Design a binder for this molecule. Sequence first.
Ligand code: ADP
Ligand code: ADP
Ligand code: GMP
Ligand code: GMP
Ligand code: GMP
Ligand code: GMP
Ligand code: K
Ligand code: K
Ligand code: K
Ligand code: K
Ligand code: K
Ligand code: MG
Ligand code: MG
Lengths: 383, 383
Amino acid sequence: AAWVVGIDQTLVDIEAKVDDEFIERYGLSAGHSLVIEDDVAEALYQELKQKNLITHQFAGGTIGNTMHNYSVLADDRSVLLGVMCSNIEIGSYAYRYLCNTSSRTDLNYLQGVDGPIGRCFTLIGESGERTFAISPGHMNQLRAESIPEDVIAGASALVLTSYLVRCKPGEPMPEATMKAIEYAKKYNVPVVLTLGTKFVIAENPQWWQQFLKDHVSILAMNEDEAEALTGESDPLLASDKALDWVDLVLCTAGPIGLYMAGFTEDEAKRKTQHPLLPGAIAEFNQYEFSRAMRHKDCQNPLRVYSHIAPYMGGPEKIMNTNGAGDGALAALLHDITANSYHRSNVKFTWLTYSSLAQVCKYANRVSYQVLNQHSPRLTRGLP
Amino acid sequence: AAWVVGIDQTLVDIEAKVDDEFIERYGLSAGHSLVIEDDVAEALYQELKQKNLITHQFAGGTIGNTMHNYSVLADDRSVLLGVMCSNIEIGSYAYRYLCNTSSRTDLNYLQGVDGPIGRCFTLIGESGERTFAISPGHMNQLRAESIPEDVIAGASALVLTSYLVRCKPGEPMPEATMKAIEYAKKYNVPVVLTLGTKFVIAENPQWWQQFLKDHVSILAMNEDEAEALTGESDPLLASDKALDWVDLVLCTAGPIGLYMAGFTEDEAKRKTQHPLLPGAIAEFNQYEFSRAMRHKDCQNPLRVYSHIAPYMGGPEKIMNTNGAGDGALAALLHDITANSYHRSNVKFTWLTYSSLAQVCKYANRVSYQVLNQHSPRLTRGLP
Ligand SMILES: Nc1ncnc2c1ncn2[C@@H]1O[C@H](COP(=O)(O)OP(=O)(O)O)[C@@H](O)[C@H]1O
Ligand SMILES: Nc1ncnc2c1ncn2[C@@H]1O[C@H](COP(=O)(O)OP(=O)(O)O)[C@@H](O)[C@H]1O
Ligand SMILES: Nc1nc2c(ncn2[C@@H]2O[C@H](CO)[C@@H](O)[C@H]2O)c(=O)[nH]1
Ligand SMILES: Nc1nc2c(ncn2[C@@H]2O[C@H](CO)[C@@H](O)[C@H]2O)c(=O)[nH]1
Ligand SMILES: Nc1nc2c(ncn2[C@@H]2O[C@H](CO)[C@@H](O)[C@H]2O)c(=O)[nH]1
Ligand SMILES: Nc1nc2c(ncn2[C@@H]2O[C@H](CO)[C@@H](O)[C@H]2O)c(=O)[nH]1
Ligand SMILES: [K+]
Ligand SMILES: [K+]
Ligand SMILES: [K+]
Ligand SMILES: [K+]
Ligand SMILES: [K+]
Ligand SMILES: [Mg+2]
Ligand SMILES: [Mg+2]
């Protein structure tokens, strides 16, 4: 009855640990996600195989990962829009993508293409920095016609990544994304945007601010992406600034924990039972126990905030940080879809089922689980 | 480092509720698994579509289900041997099979075939009886050459179903199964056999007894399959009889619960702390807290037994019984693979990591989880 829908560039992650000389030889920069040309991708790939450097291969992609993790956490249906090879051979990257993907992530609406899916070479340097080298293939060949209106109509949210606007001139993926947003507005489905790297956002932060104003209900980002978007180095102030443009903000801050900022109907606010925290906004967590509402659904919207430290107190061992923030987003999507199911099975129009503080606690536990494994994709739910 | 391997006939389950007149019109008998001819399968299928009777479609197959459930429970690798369409189109049954299958069930060793995978029409009658109509396609075209010796060599168990010997004359699947058993014996890998329906076993129980003697370490069955195999209507006596032929028996008994029978080194026996149960074997659970050992690894083998009632006391609602016993088997496979990992990461050579009583408790919880959903395949682990 309730489900979430996402658009991704269909990607398999190919992971390898490499030298600093490896990153330079293929024109990459540490900590970036960069699209590379086909001839560079082949030389890079051939060298990884030649030197037996590939450590893992698995379905990837920001939104693929997030829909996968949602369905693992909720054991409920998500729908992934994107491309898939029209003829899949055994053992191919497309074959692996299907096998790797969560059983409850519906892949029946992927659009056939006459070329390969994307490859993300996830390169870990000696210093521990992570770099993504993207060989797109046909991953940006999703057409607007292939966007099922009915799937978006019944969805609790439409989930997007900023990477979807990055493509070669004339490819249809940006147009397909805007068609899905059109449908979301038609059916009052909240649009979720997660940001992809500070460097990309920094290319044109003002364009992204206007995009958020125009189309986005829920924003997810880490503190560096937030600084690139808003100019605020303080995650709390960056989140508050972004509330000028969206309804609800998830801003993760690594070892500091994570922040949520949103709106609630002033009449319905709920004060916290935790000590009031100091910050750039004094006592910002005063109404942490409130549930989130879209701004338009409030007569007297009150801004509310929450912060929660990592599930992991102290410097407990991190196996691999890749994907931790997107895991926090998957927890939020679970709470939002739970609210949709509880509404159909029936006052104030809520956005989340739980309070900001409760959603933050859940997101923190999910992030921890992702930190304790190599993949950005969970394959079992929380204990 | 540790994994389990299974051989299945690659099958998608197509489920429908139908009338008693439907079962007769296609030559079926309630409660059976029957192979049907291609022209009958097409008429049966066309009628299910015409009358919009299909309620669910999902990857099926006894061993596919069990490898899937193992990997969901353990969040560890299983390997599935079998066939797969060589060219997979989007939306096809082969495409669905790959998407449905657990992320940690390795499907990279499936053998290409130039025809369709199997279809199991799972038909639920008005009276609640379940019938399986099998359209094999190329599911029995697995060749012995396609059995990876290295995969079996490092496995904690080779898992088979009695259905693997059912095929058309001249098809290679029986020979491929015997090749895998050959490798299992070569590397001292225990062979697991689960029985598929009382009616099939009853066709030649003595052949199955000799097969078990010759090749099988671990036997899994329900009480009706056990009666067909052994002639014993009492599940405890049927399990004890089967210990004449195998090392360890899992005999499930529906609302009565389930039984385990095995061997332990007499010196290493552990007495229970539960009240001694009456039965056809007096105080049969006296050494319930012992771990299981293969008979050949005992100098003084002692027969040990355990019984555990259902996790569900009382007549609590059952959503769908399909697959509950095979879920219990997946729990046992988890405990056996855990023992293999704990051995490599290091006395008596054990078969299970836990006692019979503990394995029975775990198997009962898994069965309950399968009873509380429609599919025989779990998509999330235990809480
Ligand atoms: N170094 C760390 N120590 C403890 N917790 C961490 C650490 N890095 C990430 N986390 C947890 O994972 C969450 C998301 O991490 P973050 O690095 O902010 O996201 P991203 O994956 O987007 O870079 C954090 O809110 C925190 O709970
Ligand atoms: N009617 C029932 N009531 C309670 N528990 C059940 C029932 N049917 C099955 N179970 C549970 O599921 C387990 C396996 O069920 P069973 O019907 O024996 O296996 P199969 O699926 O092979 O027919 C049982 O041991 C029991 O724990
Ligand atoms: N959609 C998409 N995901 C990306 C891109 N670059 C990196 N990622 C993914 O980001 C994930 C880590 O957060 C990896 O699984 C990558 O596949 C990109 O250009 N597009
Ligand atoms: N997200 C958000 N929307 C606002 C805010 N103030 C006004 N709006 C809405 O944004 C539009 C600009 O007037 C109108 O639809 C307003 O209702 C704000 O602080 N945050
Ligand atoms: N391998 C195999 N599984 C079967 C057969 N008949 C029924 N099943 C499966 O048994 C399961 C229920 O226990 C279903 O998922 C069916 O697909 C058969 O002939 N072969
Ligand atoms: N499973 C099992 N094997 C046995 C039993 N008794 C003897 N064997 C073995 O079966 C073979 C027949 O002698 C030999 O390998 C014996 O060690 C028994 O009760 N159960
Ligand atoms: K991000
Ligand atoms: K990770
Ligand atoms: K899958
Ligand atoms: K059975
Ligand atoms: K079931
Ligand atoms: Mg990080
Ligand atoms: Mg049953």
